[PDB]
Design a protein around this ligand. Structure first.
Ligand SMILES: CCCCCCCC/C=C\CCCCCCCC(=O)O
Ligand SMILES: CCCCCCCCCCCCCCCC(=O)O
Ligand SMILES: CCCCCCCCCCCCCCCC(=O)O
Ligand SMILES: OC[C@H]1O[C@@H](O)[C@H](O)[C@@H](O)[C@@H]1O
Length: 466
């Protein structure tokens, strides 16, 4: 199975998950600093990213790993609070700039293309205190941060992800309150955050387009988490419709406005409006874009960035009681097929990626696609010779090949999550996604390849599979 000549083989990290140095060199606190320090068993064993992989200190070690793999591209994020301790350009942390410039310069001198995420679940605490994604002020704050990043790094960086998984962030941080700042707002907070995330993204795209694109000649997108979804009963019309509606709710809610026409899906608007009215709201819980906002948001992504891990079965579930929540708005329930293997929520369904890629091609006018994350965790602790996990990768690669060859999907880059075992949010260090093992009990945080790292390097070297 020979991939296209020039196919991009990458791995990914995120600043809070790998960097440590949480207060090093004047870095301001981010919401995860606050969140993990509060404890209360919200994170596995009250763990924190105070040190994590120590990548702020040990970049040279990460570079060794990247070179060993022979990556063509490397995805990492910029820490907003590291660069701008208060979230604004009134005060710049030069050691923050130097750090990221060293990553970028080292990548380029080694022929590796940076793919840079501006914002990866890690708002400066100052900005969260000012309302976070629940307040309009965030839009200008984000746009100004984006411009600062484009200005500082965009002479070398040509591929940008503005916001990591705005869909997951909306839900986790602002609806369920499982992520900082860690307050439940079932059926309300998610949509409000989503609205501002979409506007902020679009604003940053326009800033790029107007101020930076002519000279820098790069491209800008935002990454979206996608779970492939199938009807629980394939012969059920209600389950068929429910699975499509669930895709529409979690993925197209963001992608339709940005890629298509600047507005939410009609089924999303109608479902939430109907529920909201029954619940006694004078207005829908889904905010409305003005016509000018629709015009501004439409066409603000240069490629489709998708992050795929797993698949679910979907059953229609009528909201008979008019309960308040996103699942209730969508009138669905999700569950796995009993036959699928899993570690935590990651059920191994490689064919899901093929169905997803074809869906993106069919729905979003055959765009350039980057898979900016895909991978598999092992439970801690976690054999170095991870032959079982490698099989999951192999199967996934075969499905990527199918998507390209049979379905003519324009997949240009595949990014493995992760480079390193890292701080897996609420799972802490108990979930190990790395191609490289990290010993978090060792103050030097040594990196050692899993078998998957050796096998992935072979795939890259051959540009494909046997
Ligand atoms: C990882 C499997 C997620 C499947 C969600 C598919 C349904 C899409 C439509 C509704 C979005 C609501 C999301 C609620 C997710 C709960 C996540 C959690 O408890 O950690
Ligand atoms: C604004 C509402 C739209 C609904 C968007 C739903 C997006 C899917 C939610 C699933 C969250 C799964 C999080 C996995 C945890 C992790 O990333 O470490
Ligand atoms: C001054 C405060 C104004 C707030 C007015 C309340 C607006 C209605 C929101 C209530 C949500 C819960 C409704 C009950 C659920 C149901 O009947 O199905
Ligand atoms: O859970 C594995 C990964 O999944 C994605 O939803 C997120 O972008 C990563 O930050 C996370 O570590």
């Amino acid at each position: 199975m020979a991939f296209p000549a020039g196919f991009g083989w990458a791995a990914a990290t995120a600043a809070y998950q790998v960097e440590g140095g949480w207060d090093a060199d004047g870095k301001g606190p981010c919401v995860w600093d606050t969140f993990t320090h509060q404890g209360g068993e919200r994170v596995f064993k009250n763990q924190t990213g105070d040190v994590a992989c120590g990548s702020y200190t040990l970049w040279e070690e990460d570079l060794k790993c990247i070179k060993q793999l022979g990556l063509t591209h490397y995805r990492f994020s910029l820490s907003w609070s590291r660069l701008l301790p208060d979230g604004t350009t009134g005060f710049i942390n030069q050691k923050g700039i130097d750090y990221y410039n060293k990553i970028i310069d080292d990548l380029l001198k080694n022929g590796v293309t940076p793919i840079v995420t501006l914002y990866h679940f890690d708002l400066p605490q100052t900005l969260e205190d000012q309302g976070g994604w629940l307040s309009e002020a965030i839009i200008e704050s984000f746009d100004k941060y984006a411009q600062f990043c484009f200005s500082t790094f965009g002479d070398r960086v040509k591929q940008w992800i503005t916001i990591n998984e705005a869909n997951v962030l909306s839900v986790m941080s602002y609806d369920l309150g499982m992520f900082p700042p860690g307050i439940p707002h079932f059926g309300t907070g998610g949509y409000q955050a989503a609205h501002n995330l979409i506007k902020a993204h679009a604003r940053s795209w326009h800033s790029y387009d107007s101020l930076f694109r002519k000279k820098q000649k790069g491209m800008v997108s935002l990454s979206l988490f996608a779970v492939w979804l199938e009807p629980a009963d394939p012969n059920s019309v209600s389950d068929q419709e429910a699975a499509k509606r669930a895709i529409t709710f979690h993925l197209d809610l963001f992608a339709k406005p940005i890629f298509i026409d600047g507005d939410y899906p009609e089924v999303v608007k109608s479902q939430i409006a109907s529920m909201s009215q029954k619940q006694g709201y004078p207005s829908s819980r889904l905010p409305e874009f003005t016509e000018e906002e629709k015009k501004m948001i439409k066409g603000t992504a240069d490629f489709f960035a998708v992050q795929y891990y797993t698949t679910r079965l979907i059953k229609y579930q009528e909201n008979k009681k008019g309960e308040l929540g996103i699942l209730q708005d969508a009138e669905i329930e999700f569950f796995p097929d009993p036959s699928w293997k899993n570690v935590d929520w990651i059920y191994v369904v490689p064919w899901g990626v093929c169905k997803l890629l074809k869906y993106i091609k069919d729905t979003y006018n055959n765009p350039v696609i980057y898979i900016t994350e895909n991978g598999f965790p092992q439970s801690d602790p976690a054999p170095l010779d991870d032959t079982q996990r490698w099989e999951y990768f192999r199967q996934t690669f075969q499905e990527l090949f199918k998507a390209i060859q049979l379905d003519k999907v324009n997949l240009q880059v595949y990014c493995a999550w992760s480079l390193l075992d890292n701080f897996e949010w609420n799972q802490g260090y108990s979930s190990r996604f790395g191609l490289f093992h990290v010993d978090f009990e060792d103050p030097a945080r040594p990196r050692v390849p899993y078998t998957s790292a050796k096998e992935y390097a072979k795939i890259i070297r051959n540009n494909g599979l046997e």
